[PDB]
A paper describes a structure:
Human MutT homologue 1 (MTH1)3 belongs to the NUDIX family of proteins (1) and catalyzes the hydrolysis of the oxidized purine nucleoside triphosphates 8-oxo-dGTP, 8-oxo-GTP, 2-OH-dATP, and 2-OH-ATP into their corresponding monophosphates (2). Removal of oxidized purine nucleoside triphosphates from the free nucleotide pool through MTH1-catalyzed hydrolysis prevents misincorporation of these nucleotides into DNA and RNA and reduces genotoxicity. We recently reported that human MTH1, in addition to hydrolyzing oxidized purine nucleoside triphosphates, also is a highly efficient catalyst of O6-methyl-dGTP hydrolysis. We show that human MTH1 effectively catalyzes the hydrolysis of N6-methyl-dATP to N6-methyl-dAMP and also catalyzes N6-methyl-ATP hydrolysis, albeit at a lower rate.
To determine the binding mode of N6-methyl-dATP in the active site of MTH1, co-crystals of the nucleotide with hMTH1 were grown. The structure was solved to 2.45 Å resolution and the overall structure is shown in Fig. 6A. The structure shows clear electron density for N6-methyl-dAMP, indicating that hydrolysis of N6-methyl-dATP to the monophosphate form occurred during co-crystallization. The protein crystallized with four monomers in the asymmetric unit (chains A, B, C, and D). The nucleotide-binding pocket of hMTH1 is comprised of a large number of hydrophobic amino acids including Phe-27, Phe-72, Phe-74, Met-81, Trp-117, and Phe-139. The purine ring system of N6-methyl-dAMP is positioned by π-stacking interactions involving Trp-117 and Phe-72 and two hydrogen bonds with residue Asp-119, which also makes a weak interaction (3 Å) with nearby Asp-120. Asn-33 interacts weakly with the adenine base and the deoxyribose moiety of N6-methyl-dAMP as indicated by the longer bond distances of 3.4–3.5 Å. The deoxyribose group is further positioned by a hydrogen bond (2.5 Å) with the main chain carbonyl oxygen of Thr-8. In contrast to these previously solved structures, where both Asp-119 and Asp-120 interact with the modified nucleotides through hydrogen bonds, only Asp-119 makes direct hydrogen bond interactions to the nucleotide base in the MTH1 structure with N6-methyl-dAMP, with no atom of the nucleotide base of N6-methyl-dAMP within hydrogen bonding distance of Asp-120. The clear substrate preference of MTH1 for N6-methyl-dATP over dATP can be explained by the hydrophobic active site subpocket, made up by Phe-72, Phe-74, and Phe-139, which provides favorable hydrophobic interactions with the methyl group of N6-methyl-dATP.
Residue numbers in the entry: 3 to 156
């Protein structure tokens, strides 16, 4: 049993857009844009919607770059996070109730202030390799187990 989530990384040649999460889950950490996938929308539509809701950005097209399953010790449901990237955004990022956007250079990504797993799979993201990840967490800071493999289709 798992719940679908989306995650969107606005990746441009020399920079990436991240949102400081202001309230709730993953608060105080930089991350891509996303959330729960709703009933009546595709995974890609939920990703575009969550990008719009959190950053005010529309996009020409999104591409599937990976799937990461997260297990939290004690919680029965897994988080099945579908990851997306994009280059051509439309408009300028604006602050929402959830997210404060900010550009970062690719060698200045604040992994110390992000979900610890990001360290592991970002390199594949930057290399444009598709991937399947799994991370078993104890609380929000400790990875107990993980797997990570290159794939051909997500
Ligand atoms: C647990 N480790 C993790 N590493 C990277 N991204 C994560 C994550 N756990 C959740 N996320 C992402 C998936 C969604 O885009 C968002 C959670 O949605 P929410 O902020 O609406 O609760 O954060």
């Amino acid at each position: 049993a798992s719940r679908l989530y989306t995650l969107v990384l606005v990746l441009q040649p020399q920079r990436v857009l991240l949102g400081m999460k202001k309230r709730g889950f993953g608060a105080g950490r930089w991350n891509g844009f996303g959330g729960k996938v709703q009933e009546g929308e595709t995974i890609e539509d939920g990703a575009r919607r969550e990008l719009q809701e959190e950053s005010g950005l529309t996009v020409d097209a999104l591409h599937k770059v990976g799937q990461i399953v997260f297990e939290f010790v004690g919680e029965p449901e897994l988080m099945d996070v579908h990851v997306f990237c994009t280059d051509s955004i439309q408009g300028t990022p604006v602050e929402s109730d959830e997210m404060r956007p900010c550009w970062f250079q690719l060698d200045q990504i604040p992994f110390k202030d992000m979900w610890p797993d990001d360290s592991y799979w970002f390199p594949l993201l930057l290399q444009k390799k598709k991937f399947h990840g799994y991370f078993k967490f104890q609380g929000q800071d400790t990875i107990l187990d993980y797997t990570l493999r290159e794939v051909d289709t997500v």
